[PDB]
Amino acid sequence: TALVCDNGSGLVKAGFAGDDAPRAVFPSIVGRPRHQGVMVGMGQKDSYVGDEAQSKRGILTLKYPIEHGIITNWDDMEKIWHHTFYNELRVAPEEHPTLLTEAPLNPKANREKMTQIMFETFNVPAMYVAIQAVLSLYASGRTTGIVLDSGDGVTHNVPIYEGYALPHAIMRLDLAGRDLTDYLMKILTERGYSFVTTAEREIVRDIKEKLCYVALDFENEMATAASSSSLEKSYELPDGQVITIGNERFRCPETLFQPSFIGMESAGIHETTYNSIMKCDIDIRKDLYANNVMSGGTTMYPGIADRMQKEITALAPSTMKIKIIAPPERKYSVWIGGSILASLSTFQQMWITKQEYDEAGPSIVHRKCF
Amino acid sequence: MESAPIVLDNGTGFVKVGYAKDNFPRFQFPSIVGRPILRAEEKTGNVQIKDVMVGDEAEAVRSLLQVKYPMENGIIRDFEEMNQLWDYTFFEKLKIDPRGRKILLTEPPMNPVANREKMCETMFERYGFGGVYVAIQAVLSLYAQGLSSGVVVDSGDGVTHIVPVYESVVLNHLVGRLDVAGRDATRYLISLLLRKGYAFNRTADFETVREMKEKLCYVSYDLELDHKLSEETTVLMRNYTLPDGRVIKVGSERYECPECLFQPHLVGSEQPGLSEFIFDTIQAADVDIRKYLYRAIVLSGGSSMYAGLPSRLEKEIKQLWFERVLHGDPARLPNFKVKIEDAPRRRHAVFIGGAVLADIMAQNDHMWVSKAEWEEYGVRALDKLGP
Amino acid sequence: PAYHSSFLSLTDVPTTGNIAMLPLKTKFRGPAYPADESQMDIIDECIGLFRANCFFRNFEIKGPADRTLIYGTLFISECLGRVNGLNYRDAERQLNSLALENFSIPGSGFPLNALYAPPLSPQDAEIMRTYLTQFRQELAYRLLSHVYATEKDHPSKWWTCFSKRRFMNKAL
Amino acid sequence: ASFNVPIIMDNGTGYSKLGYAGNDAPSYVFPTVIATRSKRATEDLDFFIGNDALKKASAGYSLDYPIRHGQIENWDHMERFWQQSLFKYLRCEPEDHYFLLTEPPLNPPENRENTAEIMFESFNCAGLYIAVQAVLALAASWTSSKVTDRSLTGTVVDSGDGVTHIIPVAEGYVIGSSIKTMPLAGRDVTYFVQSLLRDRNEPDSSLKTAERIKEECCYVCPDIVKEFSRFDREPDRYLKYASESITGHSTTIDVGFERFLAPEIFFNPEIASSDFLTPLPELVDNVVQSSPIDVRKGLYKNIVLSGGSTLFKNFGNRLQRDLKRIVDERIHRSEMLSGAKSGGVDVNVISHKRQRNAVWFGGSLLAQTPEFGSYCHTKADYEEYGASIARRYQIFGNSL
Amino acid sequence: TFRTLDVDSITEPVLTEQDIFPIRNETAEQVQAAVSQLIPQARSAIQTGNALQGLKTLLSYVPYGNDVQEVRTQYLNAFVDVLSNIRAADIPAFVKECSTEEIDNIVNFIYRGLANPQAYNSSVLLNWHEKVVEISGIGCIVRVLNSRPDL
């Protein structure tokens, strides 16, 4: 078995090649205690990761060692990788070759340090570092498509046709579930609710996952919310305190289509996808409209595929047949695609081995990986 | 007196009130309401206590009162007591008939909408003001400077809030609350003095430690130096006499109390302190405007008045740019320019700027939300008051 | 906290200065409106609360009903000072003599002249005196039914111990 | 560290509990009192402590309690109390042993500094751990020492002779920002019982007689105006207590409303004091509502009682019902705004077989840990840095 | 963490001692030669039993500078040796005839002597301190407090 590890910007997903779901899926978080007052000898330690960091979160300051798809803390990312191998998968990584994942248009030093730590600290036999969006295509049983991936820290469009990527037409936006959680923590202040700790951020992420949705037509949902409580819902805080949420349910996801809600100068995900297909050549522009693959947990909102369809059909010419491809497994599609790729016969010659790393150094990843 | 617009800084710790073109508050008094109490305490025939007593009438007499605050954290907690402050403010401080007047109100940038709605409703439907404007407190503190760009940080009794402004555009996505201010520092002084065996649990004693903090506390410029003066020396020791006549000794608590602004974890908050909250805010602004925000960090509000706070804040921003931008390389640090703006009048910069803005819009009758507009649109009349 | 008057929940009650002239069950002459004989009134409340309330050292007054309960509470402390060692009959005559003798009203040596209003007119003073004399005669007569409940020639020690429990450190 | 059993000393305001780690009880439980005299000078040798000091008041010794309101305030007397604890009662050599000491969460930096110099320079102990006292009382609450029985989140209400403090602890970490203290405990309820015997002019109002009337006669009622009324309605509510005088003759005391009115000191501290006003159920609410939102269910689900002054009959039930009232009124204000029922929160106040000495039993259980000698100051740390090594607050957030 | 990084030492350079006290207008070898001419006169005045003239000649010039500790300590060795060889009855008659600048130099160099008792006899320096302060007053010590740090 090869390992597949999706280096999720908010959620690590790990398992073995040829399996059809992650064996382990957990928060990409390291938590540290915000109190020095202690019980002696009591199972009590300098850091917690993943599900220990979530279950202990009230007394921890939580930080993600990835922000916007880039590893900002290498000393804590090696704790997360150590936890994937020795605690979640329960393997010695020096026995198993590892497929890793990366966002497009990242710093090259991210992919260099990511190959360096894997050979120099985890002693792996071999490894590879695929762009996430081509894995999500391979997870869906097609060789043409435009993949809208949207995780915790990044959202990106990759056009791909007959198995050839169009790298000049790739788009990347530093706006996803982290920024939507920030904006929900912000706009819930207008109801009178204050969420400010890195633990309350995880409560507001759960409010967002359970109750937020994409409005099919935003200004009509605003007029609906101003007219009736039929749009409002209730949430049980961990305190047993009951919270009421209304237009914040759809104002939060509207930021994905209107980045100016967070002061960000960008196209929304409709216009970003349109400009990405419109940057491909005219014969390929006929086909990728019928194959808008959606991927990652920020593409998981209720109503998102129907509104993504009604927006992208207003930008495209009226003769085009448009399809949004949004599987119920889309949360895991980059991992499922990595599980497929690491199982292919023709892939086994294109790993990076420990031998060619010793012969070339960490810069080898730029000649082996797209 | 005059037909001018009234300006009211109905702040969490103090009301300040007056009119357009006033260079200082016409009156300022504690935003407190008192009810009669008896408390195994001194009594005399030389005073009389009414069933509601407020502002200066309460604060001068507070041994005789159950003191309560209508506001906390920048929001009205009890409108029945806020009505008693507003009655006092208009009818026996200003000695004015509000009927058809225009009034400028203030609040911090991230309040619940119900605060502004029920506050404007009260102005239209208790007092019968002819129009209202509600201004963000920190943009008024920039009007007091005569200034159109800079990051303005206002710290009062209830909340510390920050508003970046560039070329008169307000950067609404960058505005933030640090939920630590003068009341948290006063509650922390009570907690620190409780480790020394003193007690201040009566509602009347909160104003006593407020005056003690306001007299004796200062911001340490260099923590290991103030800890050295604290642990190796008696020079930080000071005596304070309570209105009881009791004397208390205070030492490290003088720098350890306001340190909760720069280290919020001391009061249980997980937020970054003043310097790191201001730095994370400027460093989130666009590349072309960061220099103009660092060259004008405008301090405002009473909780900016601790001795050495401007010095500590400037240092600690230079020191934080040196860690997080230069990664500890000295060679470029002299090129980084920061300027804290630290005016003498800055406790009242919100009022003084409200008195400027209320004059700029006094003749522009369409700029105010009208009573005739409120009674036909309701709360949707307030959609005039910015995004 | 301390216990406040249930009669603070009453409204449109007659008043003098800021005493409430509450409905009173009594056979003494004066201005107080006859209460129902079947229900607790301010004197059944004032004696029932007194031996709890005299231990508290903090009390916030909700209105004129509590100003009336406080004047009663201070007068029960006076009665339990006057009553000691007496027969029930000697106590009735001593505590009626105490109730009737010339006392300070609010607005005159009154101990709480900051918390009570002066009488609102020269005639309000006479209705305040004629109410407070009737009230405190009834309050004295009612207390004696409790302190001489089990025996008749000596005051119960379970009531005489409050004779130095000076409510809020105030006395008449 | 040494292989010898650590020595546990919980020095309370009322009582000192002395023993060795791993025993099924303290070896000694006696008052934190010293009896002192008031051609070679030896009056600093002539003192006595504990039960043997109580015997010396008739021999002209002045008794004093060197700990008052939780804090040591006479370091001459506390040094002599510790030397007599070590060399008479525990009969131990400090050079061979590691020590577990205790003090309240508020206690001054000055007290831990003064404690460390007496332990390392007067006695020369091998090492010292000064524990956060009610954090040990959480560990005494376990059903057994095994890891599966541990409940590392809970509020602990400790109420001894001198002070009562409510400590939130979650996942084994103390939330020091949320500590509340009430300056009233078992001694203030004795002074109130004594004051009521004295108001009735009873034949005896000595401090021992007021103490014994707390331990035997007092209990917590629902409401003092209903309970005063029950002392009219039912006649056997008044007890008769037989007491023997200092000069050795019998007396009989009628005990009355102090049976319920004296334990009411915790639930209405305006009875005891001008300076503290918040009742214990509201004070425990203020601890949990100042504490982080994710730990609030855990802190209400496990409210551990500790210290002798929590042992009043019906005390945990009064605290539970009054706190459940505060908690459900706050939850229902939110259900009534939202139009949906919550899951609620269970408030559980826990009384347990080791509640009387929970700090000592916790100190014993934590000093048995293989790691314990690494949490102590060793005398080699003290030889470098002196008493400043103990000065920094353990429980609260420090600047620098 | 940022709190401990010294920014002040590089963003606001503080005054140096040579901003307060003027630079020495003589080179290190020039002052070392000037003292090396005086020490033999100071030694010779002890052998003729004229140690009072030994001090009056030695005191006519004083070395200063952080670059000259070797010749400053050689001058201090000669100064303490001269003061140790003057008879205690001669001190009052000599001190009253010194200038204010010679007195300032005597009270400065008895202070450099008192700072190093393993080299210098404090007993004679304290006897000189008593008599110089008795005759010339407190202001001579005030001039030493205020004096240059590289004397």
Ligand SMILES: Nc1ncnc2c1ncn2[C@@H]1O[C@H](COP(=O)(O)OP(=O)(O)OP(=O)(O)O)[C@@H](O)[C@H]1O
């Ligand atoms: N010299 C001072 N030193 C320290 N604190 C001060 C000083 N002067 C005022 N304060 C504190 O500032 C607070 C009052 O400031 P201010 O009037 O600006 O607050 P506010 O406007 O009423 O509150 P807010 O703006 O949050 O609603 C009080 O806590 C007061 O003690």
Ligand SMILES: Nc1ncnc2c1ncn2[C@@H]1O[C@H](COP(=O)(O)OP(=O)(O)O)[C@@H](O)[C@H]1O
């Ligand atoms: N059902 C959902 N609806 C909306 N957001 C969701 C949903 N499920 C998960 N999320 C969001 O998915 C994000 C994580 O997506 P993921 O694809 O795992 O990102 P990443 O791979 O980069 O770590 C989180 O921000 C989370 O809030």
Ligand SMILES: Nc1ncnc2c1ncn2[C@@H]1O[C@H](COP(=O)(O)OP(=O)(O)O)[C@@H](O)[C@H]1O
């Ligand atoms: N059964 C009891 N009921 C009520 N109080 C008790 C009981 N047993 C002991 N006490 C009281 O508990 C207090 C001693 O508790 P302890 O925990 O030993 O205090 P401390 O540690 O502070 O010295 C004393 O006031 C004592 O009289």
Ligand SMILES: [Mg+2]
């Ligand atoms: Mg991802």
Ligand SMILES: [Mg+2]
């Ligand atoms: Mg303000």
Ligand SMILES: [Mg+2]
């Ligand atoms: Mg104790």
